[PDB]
Amino acid sequence: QSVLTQPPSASGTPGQRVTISCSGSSSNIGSNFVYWYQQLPGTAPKLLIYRNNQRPSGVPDRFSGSRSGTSASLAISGLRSEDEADYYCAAWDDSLGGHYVFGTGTKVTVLRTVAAPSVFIFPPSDEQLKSGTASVVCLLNNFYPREAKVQWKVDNALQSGNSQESVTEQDSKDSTYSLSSTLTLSKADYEKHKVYACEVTHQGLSSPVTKSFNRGE
Amino acid sequence: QVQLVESGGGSVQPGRSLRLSCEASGFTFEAYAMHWVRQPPGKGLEWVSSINWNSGRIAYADSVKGRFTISRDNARNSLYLQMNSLRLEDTAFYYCAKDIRRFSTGGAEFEYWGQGTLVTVSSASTKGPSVFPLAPGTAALGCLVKDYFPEPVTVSWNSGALTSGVHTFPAVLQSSGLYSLSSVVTVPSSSLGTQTYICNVNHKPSNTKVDKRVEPKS
């Protein structure tokens, strides 16, 4: 299928100017208006630029767009953490009796300083245990950058294949990430061990942090 | 102010049918072409269908032609999308969109979008969640929302009175085929004996709403 090619990502420090390219063909960008859409995490695409360079009211003037030949470009001046989002270009394509083409999309990341996580650990509740399963949850709060090593030790034995991680999108106010790691055990396996520990190694830490508990305390 | 609310999403078995609707207000609905756009979770955007102000002009993307039927009711400010013979790859947020131009006939310019309704095409059956507490200078607490299907769940705290410090994590699919997620919040330790913490869990596909009080344990 037809598509307009955008870089997968783009970044800048706050206040800098990020530009996103969008290349297509003579039958779409070369013939028709280009639109741009901003998608903040958890929300629908919102109109950002229409007709190559028109700004809807309510869109700050630091957003500008341009079209040249079969290429288009978005420029975000004065980058702010609120601009962390996915950006799509789009244009109508006259080929094959006409069809609407969207760009592949660009995630904009605001670069900031390294920040270590705050680590919390949550034992399983008794309400959950009473139905046969134990989830142990390790929380990493507000850290940068996104890469992090999060491991589980049960009575000092490294765990594998029984945990799942989830990571938030970049925060719109402080540009950090949060992460949960969840270890799952049957009640019977949970009950045969004593010490539960998640260890976190991260670029903001000089050495790994451990949070742990003893089953029943 | 323009408003667009899609509904009709949820899970549906492959091969079967599902009809989506969009409610519109805040503009003269009968003057504008309307559009459906979809986005499979974590992916890009794909135009689905368009219908002009008087339904005299209708267009479909090749990926849905012959299976989907778009329609509208100007008297009820409503746009519709009947989807038949659904396949897994039709799984997506379906968005309703209002054109920027009045009385156009061709193409499509997307001015306003509804927040979308999620369509999950799956063999799995719908299942409500269980809600467990993640019990507590700073303290963390939260709720664990486990073993539901399909997406989405939404989570608020103290009915929207508590937003600062909240992280509701993207759901993950467990090896069991059910989803799970956590919502947590960091709060002052000084508040734990005085301030009440309730997470409000909403799973529309199963008509489940849960207010879970999360207290320090004994």
Short mmCIF file of C-alpha atoms in Angstrom, two decimals:
data_model
loop_
_atom_site.label_atom_id
_atom_site.label_comp_id
_atom_site.label_asym_id
_atom_site.label_seq_id
_atom_site.Cartn_x
_atom_site.Cartn_y
_atom_site.Cartn_z
CA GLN A 1 0.00 0.00 0.00
CA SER A 2 1.04 3.65 -0.52
CA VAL A 3 2.64 5.49 2.41
CA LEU A 4 4.52 8.72 3.14
CA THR A 5 7.85 8.04 4.81
CA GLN A 6 8.70 9.78 8.12
CA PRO A 7 11.64 9.03 10.42
CA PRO A 8 10.60 6.73 13.28
CA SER A 9 11.86 9.18 15.91
CA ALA A 10 13.15 12.64 16.62
CA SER A 11 14.49 14.31 19.72
CA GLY A 12 15.62 17.62 21.11
CA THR A 13 16.45 19.40 24.32
CA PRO A 14 13.83 21.84 25.66
CA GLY A 15 13.63 25.09 23.73
CA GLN A 16 15.33 23.61 20.70
CA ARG A 17 13.80 23.28 17.23
CA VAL A 18 12.90 19.76 16.06
CA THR A 19 11.95 19.15 12.43
CA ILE A 20 10.19 16.07 11.04
CA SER A 21 10.43 15.17 7.38
CA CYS A 22 7.73 13.49 5.29
CA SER A 23 8.49 12.22 1.81
CA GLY A 24 5.89 10.94 -0.62
CA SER A 25 5.27 11.01 -4.34
CA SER A 26 4.07 13.14 -7.22
CA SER A 27 0.47 11.85 -6.94
CA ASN A 28 -0.03 12.63 -3.24
CA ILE A 29 2.25 15.36 -1.77
CA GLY A 30 3.10 16.56 -5.28
CA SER A 31 -0.60 17.15 -6.01
CA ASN A 32 -2.61 17.69 -2.83
CA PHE A 33 -2.56 19.46 0.51
CA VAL A 34 -0.49 18.04 3.36
CA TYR A 35 -1.96 17.72 6.84
CA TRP A 36 -0.17 17.11 10.15
CA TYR A 37 -1.62 15.47 13.25
CA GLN A 38 -0.39 15.32 16.83
CA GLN A 39 -1.22 12.31 18.99
CA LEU A 40 -0.50 12.66 22.69
CA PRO A 41 -0.39 9.36 24.60
CA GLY A 42 -3.84 8.03 25.45
CA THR A 43 -5.63 10.37 23.01
CA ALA A 44 -6.88 10.62 19.45
CA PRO A 45 -4.97 12.41 16.68
CA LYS A 46 -5.57 16.17 16.81
CA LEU A 47 -5.32 18.51 13.81
CA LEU A 48 -1.98 20.32 13.97
CA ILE A 49 -1.43 21.78 10.49
CA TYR A 50 -3.85 21.93 7.61
CA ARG A 51 -3.32 22.87 3.96
CA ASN A 52 0.51 22.62 4.15
CA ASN A 53 1.01 25.56 6.47
CA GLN A 54 -2.27 26.73 8.09
CA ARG A 55 -2.51 26.59 11.90
CA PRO A 56 -5.89 25.99 13.55
CA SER A 57 -6.56 28.53 16.26
CA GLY A 58 -5.44 27.09 19.54
CA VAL A 59 -2.27 25.66 17.97
CA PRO A 60 0.82 27.70 19.04
CA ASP A 61 2.78 29.53 16.35
CA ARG A 62 5.93 27.55 17.21
CA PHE A 63 4.35 24.79 15.07
CA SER A 64 4.93 25.39 11.35
CA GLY A 65 4.74 23.23 8.26
CA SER A 66 5.98 23.47 4.69
CA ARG A 67 5.65 21.58 1.39
CA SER A 68 8.20 21.38 -1.42
CA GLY A 69 7.94 19.12 -4.44
CA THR A 70 7.09 15.65 -3.17
CA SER A 71 8.29 16.44 0.38
CA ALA A 72 6.80 18.14 3.41
CA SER A 73 8.21 19.15 6.74
CA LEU A 74 7.04 19.98 10.24
CA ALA A 75 9.11 22.19 12.55
CA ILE A 76 8.49 22.44 16.28
CA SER A 77 10.19 25.56 17.62
CA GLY A 78 10.76 26.02 21.31
CA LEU A 79 10.40 22.33 22.13
CA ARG A 80 8.45 21.67 25.32
CA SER A 81 7.78 18.47 27.22
CA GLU A 82 4.10 18.85 26.36
CA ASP A 83 5.16 18.24 22.74
CA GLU A 84 6.19 14.64 23.46
CA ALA A 85 3.81 12.85 21.09
CA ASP A 86 3.49 11.01 17.81
CA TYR A 87 3.21 13.18 14.72
CA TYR A 88 1.69 12.07 11.43
CA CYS A 89 1.66 13.76 8.08
CA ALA A 90 -1.06 12.89 5.57
CA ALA A 91 -2.18 13.77 2.07
CA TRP A 92 -4.68 12.66 -0.56
CA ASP A 93 -3.29 10.42 -3.31
CA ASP A 94 -4.83 10.75 -6.79
CA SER A 95 -3.55 7.36 -8.02
CA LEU A 96 -5.82 4.34 -8.38
CA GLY A 97 -9.01 6.40 -8.33
CA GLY A 98 -8.06 8.28 -5.16
CA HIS A 99 -7.28 7.27 -1.57
CA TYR A 100 -6.09 8.91 1.65
CA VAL A 101 -2.48 8.28 2.69
CA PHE A 102 -1.06 8.71 6.22
CA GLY A 103 2.61 9.02 7.13
CA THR A 104 4.31 6.25 9.09
CA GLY A 105 4.64 8.55 12.11
CA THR A 106 7.36 10.05 14.28
CA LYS A 107 7.71 9.86 18.05
CA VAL A 108 9.20 13.03 19.53
CA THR A 109 11.26 12.59 22.70
CA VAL A 110 12.41 15.48 24.88
CA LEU A 111 16.01 14.92 25.99
CA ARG A 112 16.75 15.65 29.66
CA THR A 113 19.23 14.80 32.40
CA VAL A 114 19.72 11.29 33.82
CA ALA A 115 17.46 10.59 36.78
CA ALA A 116 17.55 7.51 38.97
CA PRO A 117 14.25 5.75 39.76
CA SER A 118 12.52 5.53 43.11
CA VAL A 119 11.92 1.84 43.80
CA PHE A 120 8.95 0.39 45.67
CA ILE A 121 7.95 -3.26 46.13
CA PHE A 122 4.41 -4.53 46.82
CA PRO A 123 3.78 -8.03 48.21
CA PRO A 124 0.63 -9.83 47.06
CA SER A 125 -2.56 -9.04 48.92
CA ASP A 126 -4.26 -11.69 50.99
CA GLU A 127 -7.40 -11.17 48.91
CA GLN A 128 -5.46 -12.32 45.83
CA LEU A 129 -3.69 -15.16 47.66
CA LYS A 130 -7.08 -16.49 48.71
CA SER A 131 -7.85 -17.23 45.03
CA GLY A 132 -4.64 -19.22 44.42
CA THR A 133 -2.25 -16.72 42.79
CA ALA A 134 0.42 -14.25 43.92
CA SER A 135 1.51 -11.16 41.99
CA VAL A 136 4.56 -9.32 43.31
CA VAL A 137 4.91 -5.81 41.89
CA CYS A 138 8.09 -3.73 41.61
CA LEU A 139 7.61 -0.05 40.82
CA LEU A 140 10.24 2.23 39.24
CA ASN A 141 9.10 5.84 39.59
CA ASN A 142 10.21 8.71 37.30
CA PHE A 143 13.62 7.89 35.82
CA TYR A 144 15.59 8.75 32.71
CA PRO A 145 16.57 7.36 30.32
CA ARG A 146 14.13 4.57 29.52
CA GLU A 147 16.53 1.61 29.49
CA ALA A 148 16.64 -0.21 32.83
CA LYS A 149 17.55 -3.68 34.14
CA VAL A 150 14.95 -5.08 36.54
CA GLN A 151 15.49 -8.56 37.93
CA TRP A 152 13.75 -10.75 40.51
CA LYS A 153 15.41 -12.90 43.16
CA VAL A 154 13.43 -15.34 45.31
CA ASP A 155 15.61 -16.61 48.18
CA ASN A 156 18.51 -15.22 46.10
CA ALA A 157 17.62 -17.34 43.03
CA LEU A 158 17.36 -15.35 39.78
CA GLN A 159 13.94 -15.61 38.17
CA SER A 160 13.15 -16.10 34.49
CA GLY A 161 10.02 -16.46 32.40
CA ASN A 162 7.56 -15.50 35.17
CA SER A 163 7.60 -11.68 35.04
CA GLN A 164 6.25 -9.01 32.72
CA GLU A 165 7.24 -5.37 32.42
CA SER A 166 5.20 -2.29 31.55
CA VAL A 167 6.60 1.19 30.86
CA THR A 168 4.72 4.50 30.65
CA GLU A 169 5.24 6.95 27.81
CA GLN A 170 7.40 9.99 28.48
CA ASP A 171 5.77 12.19 31.14
CA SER A 172 4.35 15.44 29.79
CA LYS A 173 5.64 17.61 32.69
CA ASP A 174 9.04 16.17 33.74
CA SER A 175 10.01 14.00 30.73
CA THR A 176 10.69 10.88 32.82
CA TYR A 177 9.55 7.28 32.52
CA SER A 178 7.96 4.94 35.02
CA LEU A 179 8.06 1.14 34.92
CA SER A 180 6.28 -1.74 36.64
CA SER A 181 7.62 -5.27 36.78
CA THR A 182 5.24 -7.98 37.93
CA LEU A 183 6.31 -11.44 39.07
CA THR A 184 3.58 -14.11 39.08
CA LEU A 185 3.53 -17.34 41.10
CA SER A 186 0.95 -19.83 42.15
CA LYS A 187 -0.01 -19.66 45.83
CA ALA A 188 1.83 -22.94 46.43
CA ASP A 189 5.13 -21.74 44.94
CA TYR A 190 4.83 -18.35 46.65
CA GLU A 191 4.35 -20.18 49.96
CA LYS A 192 7.50 -22.29 49.71
CA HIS A 193 9.94 -19.33 49.72
CA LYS A 194 10.80 -16.54 52.15
CA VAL A 195 12.68 -13.57 50.62
CA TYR A 196 11.31 -11.70 47.62
CA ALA A 197 13.52 -9.07 46.02
CA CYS A 198 13.58 -6.94 42.91
CA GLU A 199 16.93 -5.40 41.95
CA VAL A 200 17.20 -2.39 39.68
CA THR A 201 20.36 -1.34 37.84
CA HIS A 202 20.07 2.00 36.00
CA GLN A 203 22.32 4.75 34.60
CA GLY A 204 21.28 7.12 37.40
CA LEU A 205 22.48 4.69 40.04
CA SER A 206 26.11 4.16 41.02
CA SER A 207 25.28 0.58 42.03
CA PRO A 208 22.11 -1.56 42.02
CA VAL A 209 19.25 -0.81 44.39
CA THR A 210 17.30 -3.68 45.97
CA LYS A 211 13.88 -3.59 47.59
CA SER A 212 12.81 -6.77 49.33
CA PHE A 213 10.38 -8.25 51.83
CA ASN A 214 9.97 -11.45 53.82
CA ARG A 215 6.77 -13.38 53.18
CA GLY A 216 4.64 -12.83 56.26
CA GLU A 217 5.93 -9.79 58.15
CA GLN B 1 -17.42 23.30 21.03
CA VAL B 2 -17.33 20.32 18.69
CA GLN B 3 -17.84 16.92 20.31
CA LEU B 4 -17.65 13.45 18.77
CA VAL B 5 -18.35 10.29 20.78
CA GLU B 6 -17.94 6.87 19.22
CA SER B 7 -19.43 3.75 20.76
CA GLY B 8 -20.13 0.15 19.86
CA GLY B 9 -16.61 -1.17 20.48
CA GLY B 10 -15.70 -4.17 22.56
CA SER B 11 -14.66 -7.65 21.55
CA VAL B 12 -16.20 -9.62 18.71
CA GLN B 13 -15.45 -13.05 17.26
CA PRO B 14 -13.64 -13.30 13.91
CA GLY B 15 -16.07 -13.65 11.03
CA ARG B 16 -18.87 -11.85 12.83
CA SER B 17 -20.36 -8.35 12.63
CA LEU B 18 -20.22 -5.16 14.70
CA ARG B 19 -21.91 -1.78 14.18
CA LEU B 20 -20.14 1.35 15.40
CA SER B 21 -21.80 4.71 16.00
CA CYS B 22 -20.68 8.27 16.48
CA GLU B 23 -22.64 10.99 18.24
CA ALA B 24 -21.89 14.57 17.15
CA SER B 25 -22.71 17.99 18.62
CA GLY B 26 -21.45 21.56 18.56
CA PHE B 27 -21.66 22.08 14.80
CA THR B 28 -24.17 21.79 11.94
CA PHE B 29 -23.77 18.08 11.33
CA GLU B 30 -25.77 18.03 8.07
CA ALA B 31 -23.34 20.50 6.41
CA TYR B 32 -20.18 18.35 6.71
CA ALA B 33 -18.72 15.19 5.24
CA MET B 34 -17.81 12.65 7.92
CA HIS B 35 -15.10 10.01 8.03
CA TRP B 36 -13.92 6.89 9.84
CA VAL B 37 -10.21 6.45 10.56
CA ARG B 38 -8.71 3.53 12.44
CA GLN B 39 -5.52 2.68 14.30
CA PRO B 40 -4.53 -0.77 15.55
CA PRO B 41 -3.07 -0.37 19.04
CA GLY B 42 0.55 0.76 18.94
CA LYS B 43 0.49 1.34 15.19
CA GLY B 44 -0.26 4.01 12.61
CA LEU B 45 -3.36 5.48 11.02
CA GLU B 46 -5.53 4.18 8.19
CA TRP B 47 -8.51 5.90 6.64
CA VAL B 48 -11.53 3.58 6.54
CA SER B 49 -14.46 5.37 4.89
CA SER B 50 -16.07 8.72 3.99
CA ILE B 51 -19.62 9.96 3.43
CA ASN B 52 -20.62 13.43 2.32
CA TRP B 53 -23.31 15.66 3.81
CA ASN B 54 -26.28 14.17 1.94
CA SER B 55 -24.96 10.57 1.58
CA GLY B 56 -24.81 11.03 -2.22
CA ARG B 57 -21.05 10.30 -2.19
CA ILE B 58 -19.46 7.35 -0.37
CA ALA B 59 -15.88 6.04 -0.47
CA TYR B 60 -14.07 3.06 1.14
CA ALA B 61 -10.47 1.94 1.52
CA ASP B 62 -9.70 -1.20 -0.46
CA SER B 63 -8.99 -3.11 2.75
CA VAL B 64 -12.65 -2.83 3.77
CA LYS B 65 -14.58 -2.44 0.48
CA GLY B 66 -17.33 -5.03 0.29
CA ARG B 67 -17.33 -5.62 4.06
CA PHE B 68 -18.08 -2.26 5.66
CA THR B 69 -21.06 0.03 5.09
CA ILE B 70 -20.98 3.70 6.16
CA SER B 71 -24.14 5.72 6.68
CA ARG B 72 -25.46 8.68 8.61
CA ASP B 73 -28.68 10.08 10.03
CA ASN B 74 -28.69 13.86 9.87
CA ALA B 75 -31.85 14.09 12.00
CA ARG B 76 -30.00 12.32 14.86
CA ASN B 77 -26.52 13.91 14.37
CA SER B 78 -25.18 10.40 14.00
CA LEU B 79 -22.63 8.57 11.87
CA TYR B 80 -22.60 4.76 11.55
CA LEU B 81 -20.22 2.05 10.39
CA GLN B 82 -21.58 -1.46 9.91
CA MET B 83 -18.64 -3.88 9.89
CA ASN B 84 -19.06 -7.44 8.62
CA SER B 85 -16.78 -10.46 8.31
CA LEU B 86 -14.36 -9.03 10.85
CA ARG B 87 -10.79 -10.32 10.92
CA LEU B 88 -8.14 -10.04 13.62
CA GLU B 89 -6.32 -7.37 11.64
CA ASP B 90 -9.45 -5.16 11.92
CA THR B 91 -8.58 -4.80 15.63
CA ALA B 92 -8.18 -1.06 16.13
CA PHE B 93 -9.37 2.15 17.66
CA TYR B 94 -12.10 3.43 15.34
CA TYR B 95 -12.24 7.23 15.14
CA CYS B 96 -15.02 9.44 13.88
CA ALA B 97 -13.85 12.61 12.11
CA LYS B 98 -15.53 15.79 10.88
CA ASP B 99 -14.32 17.38 7.65
CA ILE B 100 -12.94 20.93 7.65
CA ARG B 101 -14.93 21.93 4.51
CA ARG B 102 -18.69 22.48 4.21
CA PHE B 103 -20.58 20.54 1.48
CA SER B 104 -17.48 18.98 -0.11
CA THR B 105 -17.81 15.86 -2.26
CA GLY B 106 -14.35 14.39 -2.79
CA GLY B 107 -11.34 13.50 -0.71
CA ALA B 108 -11.14 14.07 3.00
CA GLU B 109 -9.68 16.65 5.38
CA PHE B 110 -9.86 15.61 9.03
CA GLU B 111 -10.53 18.56 11.35
CA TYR B 112 -11.92 17.04 14.59
CA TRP B 113 -11.73 13.48 15.85
CA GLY B 114 -13.63 11.63 18.53
CA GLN B 115 -11.51 9.90 21.16
CA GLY B 116 -12.34 6.57 19.48
CA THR B 117 -13.86 3.21 20.38
CA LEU B 118 -11.63 0.13 20.59
CA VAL B 119 -12.67 -2.90 18.55
CA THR B 120 -11.01 -6.16 19.60
CA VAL B 121 -11.47 -9.01 17.13
CA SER B 122 -10.72 -12.20 19.07
CA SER B 123 -11.75 -15.75 19.91
CA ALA B 124 -11.46 -14.92 23.61
CA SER B 125 -14.61 -14.17 25.58
CA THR B 126 -15.29 -10.97 27.51
CA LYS B 127 -14.24 -11.09 31.17
CA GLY B 128 -14.37 -8.51 33.95
CA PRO B 129 -11.32 -7.71 36.07
CA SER B 130 -10.43 -8.38 39.64
CA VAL B 131 -9.12 -5.39 41.61
CA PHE B 132 -6.51 -5.94 44.31
CA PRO B 133 -4.80 -3.34 46.52
CA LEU B 134 -1.13 -2.48 46.27
CA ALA B 135 -0.90 -1.41 49.91
CA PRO B 136 1.58 1.37 51.01
CA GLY B 137 9.13 10.88 52.93
CA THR B 138 7.04 9.53 50.03
CA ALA B 139 4.77 6.48 49.96
CA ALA B 140 3.53 4.52 46.96
CA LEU B 141 0.20 2.72 46.75
CA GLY B 142 -2.05 1.56 43.97
CA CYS B 143 -4.43 -1.04 42.64
CA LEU B 144 -3.76 -4.16 40.58
CA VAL B 145 -6.42 -4.74 37.90
CA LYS B 146 -5.94 -8.35 36.82
CA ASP B 147 -7.38 -10.92 34.42
CA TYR B 148 -9.81 -9.04 32.17
CA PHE B 149 -10.65 -9.06 28.48
CA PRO B 150 -10.71 -7.16 26.16
CA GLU B 151 -9.03 -3.81 26.59
CA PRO B 152 -9.54 -1.07 27.82
CA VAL B 153 -9.83 -0.31 31.51
CA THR B 154 -9.68 3.24 32.78
CA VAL B 155 -8.59 4.08 36.33
CA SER B 156 -9.20 7.23 38.33
CA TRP B 157 -8.32 8.02 41.94
CA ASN B 158 -10.72 9.54 44.47
CA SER B 159 -13.06 10.06 41.52
CA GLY B 160 -10.71 12.43 39.73
CA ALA B 161 -9.81 14.50 42.79
CA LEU B 162 -6.34 12.84 42.81
CA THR B 163 -4.30 13.17 39.61
CA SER B 164 -0.87 14.38 40.72
CA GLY B 165 1.57 11.49 41.02
CA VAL B 166 -0.62 8.90 39.26
CA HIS B 167 0.85 6.35 36.86
CA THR B 168 -1.64 4.00 35.25
CA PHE B 169 0.51 1.56 33.33
CA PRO B 170 -0.21 0.28 29.82
CA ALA B 171 -1.87 -3.09 30.02
CA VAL B 172 0.02 -6.25 29.16
CA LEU B 173 -1.36 -9.51 27.82
CA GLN B 174 -0.56 -12.41 30.15
CA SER B 175 0.32 -15.88 28.92
CA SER B 176 -3.25 -16.82 29.97
CA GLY B 177 -4.77 -14.60 27.28
CA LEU B 178 -6.13 -12.15 29.88
CA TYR B 179 -4.90 -8.57 30.35
CA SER B 180 -3.48 -7.08 33.53
CA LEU B 181 -2.34 -3.62 34.63
CA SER B 182 -1.47 -1.54 37.67
CA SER B 183 -2.31 2.03 38.56
CA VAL B 184 -0.09 3.53 41.26
CA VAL B 185 0.29 6.91 42.93
CA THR B 186 2.96 8.45 45.16
CA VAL B 187 1.64 10.56 48.04
CA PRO B 188 3.02 12.03 51.28
CA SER B 189 3.64 9.47 54.01
CA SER B 190 2.11 11.94 56.49
CA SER B 191 -1.29 11.59 54.81
CA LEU B 192 -1.83 7.84 55.16
CA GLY B 193 -3.74 7.90 58.45
CA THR B 194 -5.81 10.93 57.49
CA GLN B 195 -6.48 10.80 53.71
CA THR B 196 -8.70 8.17 52.04
CA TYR B 197 -7.49 6.54 48.80
CA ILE B 198 -9.94 4.92 46.40
CA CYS B 199 -9.19 3.74 42.88
CA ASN B 200 -12.17 3.75 40.51
CA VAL B 201 -11.85 0.99 37.93
CA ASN B 202 -14.00 1.01 34.81
CA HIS B 203 -14.24 -1.88 32.32
CA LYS B 204 -17.03 -0.96 29.89
CA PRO B 205 -16.93 -4.16 27.75
CA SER B 206 -18.11 -6.10 30.83
CA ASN B 207 -20.16 -3.25 32.41
CA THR B 208 -17.90 -3.48 35.49
CA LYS B 209 -17.25 -0.48 37.76
CA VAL B 210 -15.26 -0.96 40.97
CA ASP B 211 -14.35 1.45 43.77
CA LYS B 212 -11.46 -0.16 45.68
CA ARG B 213 -10.38 1.37 48.99
CA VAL B 214 -6.63 0.87 49.46
CA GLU B 215 -5.51 1.04 53.08
CA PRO B 216 -2.29 0.34 54.96
CA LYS B 217 -2.24 -3.30 56.03
CA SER B 218 -2.07 -4.79 59.56
#
